[PDB]
Each structure stands twice: as C-alpha cells, then as structure tokens.
Amino acid sequence: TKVKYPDGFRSWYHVKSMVIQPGHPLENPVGGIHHVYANAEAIQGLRGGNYPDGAVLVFDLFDYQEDNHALVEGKRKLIGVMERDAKRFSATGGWGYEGFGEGKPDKRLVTDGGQGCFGCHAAQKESQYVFSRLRD
C-alpha cells in the first residue's frame, strides 16, 4: 500500500503548467514552476471518464531563477504522485498520495498515509479529487 515510483513519467502527456511565486500560501513546499503529467489511464479521467485503476498523475516541481524578468527552470525540487487504486487506496478516496524529493525513488515525502494530501484534494470530490483540467 505504497505508491509506486512513476518510472518514465517525463514521456507522458503534459496536462498543464503553473508558476507558484514566493508569498503564495503554498510556497512551502510547492513554490516554483510545476508541470502536470498524466499516463494514458489518467487521460481517460481528465477527458470526463471514470479514472481507472492504474491512472497516475504527476506534479513535477522545478525551482526557477529570475534572470532579467525571464523565469528559467533550475533543478527539480520534488514530484507529487497520485496513483489510482479504488480498493488499495480506499482510505484516501481511491487515490494513493506520495512525494519523491528531487523526483528520486528513494526520497519518499509522505509520512501520514496521505491524509493531509487527501484533506485538500477532497474539495474536488466532484472531479474525482483532481484539480488540473485538460486544456488544448
């Protein structure tokens, strides 16, 4: 009942991006440029279907350097991961929530079984606990 490290996520579908600048209430820990990725299964849910078991969403967070009013991607800070398994992750609404420091498989960040993650994502129950919207 741990979330698998999503190997190959950088080859997945790019859903959307956002910049969280210093002073944002979530600057700790998700300040930076983030990119959301979806595997094939997660795309089914984003397009308006039911999220199938095996759907994975990744929140890929980079530091940035402000250089002459360009924001330039620096080092990866972390990834957030939501892995769909209605039975195995039933305590957190059928998604398993994990973080990996610097996107490294060995650097697990979640210590409360994802209850804190779930606590915020629960607001989105109506879109199956996912904030990000598919855009063209």
Per CB under 8 A, residues contacting a copy of itself are 10-11, 13-14, 16-25, 27, 33, 35, 37, 64, 68-73, 76, 103, 135-136
130 touching ligand HEC, by CB under 6 A? yes
Near Zn ion in 19-48, by CB under 5 A: 23
Q: Give, as one character, the DSSP assignment of residue 125.
A: G
From residue 64 to residue 103, the character string flagging contacts with ligand HEC as x (rule: CB under 6 A) and all else as - is ----------------xxx--------------xxx----
Tokens, residue 92 = 């957190």
In the complex, least distance from residue 1 CB atom to a copy of itself, rounded to whole angstroms: 28
**How far is Cα 98 from Cα 102, in angstroms, rounded to an integer?**
13
**H/E element, 64:** strand 56-67
**How far is Cα 55 from Cα 80, in angstroms, rounded to an integer?**
14
Q: What amino acid occupies position 6?
A: P
Q: Give, as one character, the DSSP assignment of residue 10.
A: G
Partner whose binding site includes residue 42, from ligand HEC, Zn ion, a copy of itself, none (CB under 5 to 8 Å by kind): none
User: Could you list the residues that contact Zn ion (CB under 5 A)?
Assistant: 23, 69
